[PDB]
Amino acid sequence: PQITLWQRPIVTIKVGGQLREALIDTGADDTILEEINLPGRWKPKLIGGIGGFIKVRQYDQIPIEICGHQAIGTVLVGPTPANVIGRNMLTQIGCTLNF
Amino acid sequence: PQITLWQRPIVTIKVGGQLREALIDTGADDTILEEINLPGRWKPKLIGGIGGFIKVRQYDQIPIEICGHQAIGTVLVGPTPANVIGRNMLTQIGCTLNF
Ligand SMILES: CC(C)CN(C[C@@H](O)[C@H](Cc1cccc(F)c1)NC(=O)O[C@H]1[C@H]2CO[C@H]3OC[C@@H]1[C@H]3C2)S(=O)(=O)c1ccc2nc(NC3CC3)sc2c1
């Protein structure tokens, strides 16, 4: 679809067999999700944003469905205040900015 | 223009008579700039992101030129790690997401 920005650009995702809402976030390089149970091995990572940093679990090669489009890539799980779909996944679904 | 997301979506802005680069950030409700000298009255505000919060100065009705498009609105100034153009300004320049 086309999404205007009068409201937060929130879409439905499926990841790890679970349904969630997440923000289409062009200011995010990576995809970060609030605590969610994902299978398999992970690596601890510190990531920075406004306010400081958080510790996340990094999962690689995780399939995700983003508003009905299929992608696979790295998902970071940790105490983010919002689920954010970043550019690592947005590039796979052909998401662009236009003005 | 159309902007793809293989790189950070950084554009040139003019604000307060000064030139800066800033991220087109659909995950930002507000526009937040690193320390920059803006004229006039401001109100202290605490804002939250990944990692916690920051104290910012809120300036209202600030004109900004964003990649050659004119907008006016609230700009928050504080210790953000990145200059971000949020939805309060993006809606004025007709910025949309497409996939
Ligand atoms: C700040 C930008 C620069 C980065 N962030 C993406 C922004 O869109 C976040 C999303 C957000 C929204 C809501 C609450 C939040 F806690 C966070 N918006 C945001 O903080 O908004 C703030 C601010 C703007 O106005 C209002 O609107 C929401 C809230 C409030 C005040 S990020 O989440 O820190 C992030 C994400 C992925 C990522 N991947 C990385 N990979 C390594 C380097 C390679 S680093 C990295 C850093």
GROMACS .gro file of C-alpha atoms in nm, chain A residues 1-9 11 23-29 32 47-54 66-67 69 79-82 84 87-88 90-99, chain B residues 1-9 11 23-29 32 47-54 66-67 69 79-82 84 87-88 90-99:
model
   92
    1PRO     CA    1   0.000   0.000   0.000
    2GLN     CA    2   0.070   0.376   0.021
    3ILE     CA    3   0.077   0.497   0.386
    4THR     CA    4   0.048   0.868   0.476
    5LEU     CA    5   0.200   1.001   0.802
    6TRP     CA    6  -0.094   1.176   0.970
    7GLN     CA    7  -0.094   0.876   1.211
    8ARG     CA    8   0.189   0.647   1.316
    9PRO     CA    9   0.257   0.405   1.026
   11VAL     CA   10   0.121  -0.246   1.026
   23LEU     CA   11   0.593   0.078   1.323
   24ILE     CA   12   0.738   0.121   0.967
   25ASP     CA   13   1.044   0.313   1.089
   26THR     CA   14   1.278   0.464   0.823
   27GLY     CA   15   1.495   0.601   1.107
   28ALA     CA   16   1.573   0.248   1.227
   29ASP     CA   17   1.859   0.062   1.062
   32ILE     CA   18   1.361  -0.428   1.711
   47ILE     CA   19   2.214  -0.086   2.079
   48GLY     CA   20   2.180   0.296   2.109
   49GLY     CA   21   1.892   0.535   2.053
   50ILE     CA   22   1.744   0.850   2.201
   51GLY     CA   23   1.790   0.818   2.575
   52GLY     CA   24   2.084   0.574   2.580
   53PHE     CA   25   2.123   0.207   2.508
   54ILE     CA   26   1.950  -0.125   2.565
   66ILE     CA   27   0.510  -0.748   0.704
   67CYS     CA   28   0.162  -0.634   0.588
   69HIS     CA   29   0.503  -0.926   0.225
   79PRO     CA   30   1.309  -0.354   2.601
   80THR     CA   31   1.220  -0.121   2.313
   81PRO     CA   32   0.916   0.099   2.393
   82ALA     CA   33   0.781   0.024   2.037
   84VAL     CA   34   0.995  -0.112   1.489
   87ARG     CA   35   1.555  -0.071   0.686
   88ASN     CA   36   1.708  -0.425   0.695
   90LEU     CA   37   1.192  -0.254   0.460
   91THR     CA   38   1.438  -0.283   0.168
   92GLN     CA   39   1.318  -0.648   0.112
   93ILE     CA   40   0.948  -0.545   0.077
   94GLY     CA   41   1.033  -0.255  -0.166
   95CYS     CA   42   0.937   0.025   0.081
   96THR     CA   43   1.021   0.376  -0.039
   97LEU     CA   44   0.969   0.733   0.079
   98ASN     CA   45   0.806   0.975  -0.166
   99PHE     CA   46   0.748   1.354  -0.163
  100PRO     CA   47   1.198   1.285  -0.474
  101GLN     CA   48   1.158   0.908  -0.420
  102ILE     CA   49   1.409   0.776  -0.160
  103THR     CA   50   1.490   0.404  -0.127
  104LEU     CA   51   1.610   0.260   0.208
  105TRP     CA   52   1.935   0.084   0.114
  106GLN     CA   53   2.108   0.377   0.294
  107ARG     CA   54   1.985   0.600   0.574
  108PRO     CA   55   1.735   0.849   0.422
  110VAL     CA   56   1.839   1.501   0.345
  122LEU     CA   57   1.710   1.163   0.879
  123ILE     CA   58   1.356   1.128   0.728
  124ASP     CA   59   1.223   0.929   1.025
  125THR     CA   60   0.867   0.784   0.997
  126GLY     CA   61   0.913   0.636   1.348
  127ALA     CA   62   0.945   0.984   1.498
  128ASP     CA   63   0.629   1.172   1.588
  131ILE     CA   64   1.445   1.650   1.710
  146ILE     CA   65   1.097   1.288   2.563
  147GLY     CA   66   1.138   0.906   2.550
  148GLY     CA   67   1.299   0.671   2.300
  149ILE     CA   68   1.505   0.353   2.292
  150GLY     CA   69   1.737   0.375   2.590
  151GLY     CA   70   1.534   0.616   2.807
  152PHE     CA   71   1.460   0.984   2.794
  153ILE     CA   72   1.627   1.316   2.722
  165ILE     CA   73   1.342   2.007   0.405
  166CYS     CA   74   1.505   1.900   0.075
  168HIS     CA   75   1.011   2.198   0.066
  178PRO     CA   76   2.109   1.551   2.302
  179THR     CA   77   1.966   1.328   2.029
  180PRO     CA   78   2.236   1.108   1.864
  181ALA     CA   79   2.081   1.195   1.519
  183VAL     CA   80   1.544   1.344   1.285
  186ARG     CA   81   0.580   1.319   1.112
  187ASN     CA   82   0.483   1.671   1.235
  189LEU     CA   83   0.680   1.513   0.700
  190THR     CA   84   0.300   1.547   0.668
  191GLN     CA   85   0.350   1.914   0.553
  192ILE     CA   86   0.586   1.817   0.265
  193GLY     CA   87   0.352   1.533   0.145
  194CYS     CA   88   0.590   1.247   0.244
  195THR     CA   89   0.443   0.898   0.208
  196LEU     CA   90   0.558   0.539   0.245
  197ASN     CA   91   0.499   0.306  -0.050
  198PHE     CA   92   0.537  -0.072  -0.099
   0.00000   0.00000   0.00000
